From Swiss-Prot:
Source lineage: Bacteria, Pseudomonadati, Pseudomonadota, Gammaproteobacteria, Enterobacterales
Source organism of this protein record: Escherichia coli
Included range, full protein: 4 to 156 of 312
Signal peptide: none
Name assigned to this protein: Retron Ec83 reverse transcriptase
Coiled coil: none
Record-annotated Reverse transcriptase domain positions: 11-153
Gene (name only): ret
Assigned protein family: Belongs to the bacterial reverse transcriptase family.
Role description: Reverse transcriptase (RT) component of antiviral defense system retron Ec83, composed of a non-coding RNA (ncRNA), this reverse transcriptase (RT), a probable ATPase and a putative HNH endonuclease. Expression of retron Ec83 confers protection against bacteriophages T2, T4 and T6. At multiplicity of infection (MOI) of 0.02 cultures slow growth when infected with T4 but do not collapse, at MOI 2 cultures enter growth stasis. Responsible for synthesis of msDNA-Ec83 (a linear ssDNA with a 5'-terminal phosphate residue).
Amino acid sequence: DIETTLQKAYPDFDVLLKSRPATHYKVYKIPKRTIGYRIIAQPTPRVKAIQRDIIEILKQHTHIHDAATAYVDGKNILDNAKIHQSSVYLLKLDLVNFFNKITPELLFKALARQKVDISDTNKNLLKQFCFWNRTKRKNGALVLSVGAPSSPF
DNA sequence: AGCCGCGGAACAAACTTTTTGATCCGCAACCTACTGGATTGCGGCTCAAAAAGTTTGTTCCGCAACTGTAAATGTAATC
């Protein structure tokens, strides 16, 4: 249900398909409060609209498990601590490779386990319009970027 | 996600500084007067030889910031 409605709005999907839209990413760096520089790659002002639309399309047939207050609608940071108020101890994990190592190979099989079917052309569309190429070269390695509007879901 | 020059390193032949195992030669001893044989013996001193201790020329190992079309965004706070 992605390729069917892709050309309905802004019928320019014929172009920008072969012109490496994943490359359309600006890289800057924000200073942390302490040691560290955070690289952020965000799409051009045009790609974010397409990514938001495809997020809305994807949300039609998905389910997100509870106890994961990670960017779900109407759930601020307070409910994260509301569950944890009655405890006495805590063990805080912190995952490494912040969103920059989630390859597209690990999303299609995740959806397959999720029991949702996706077309091969739709799979190519997902791989091409919702990821970032750091090497900026053809047939490169695709990694999710911290900053894309499609990163949370 | 790829891998620049830089500098230690893991090895490995050459120098190089002593550990050892004889050989010697005064050197006081016998013996008796004194070179006594036709003698031993005994302790410093020196000898290369070789098992130990550096020293130096070569070969891989590792690692950083960002990449070719590309966002200035009123306030606070999250990954």
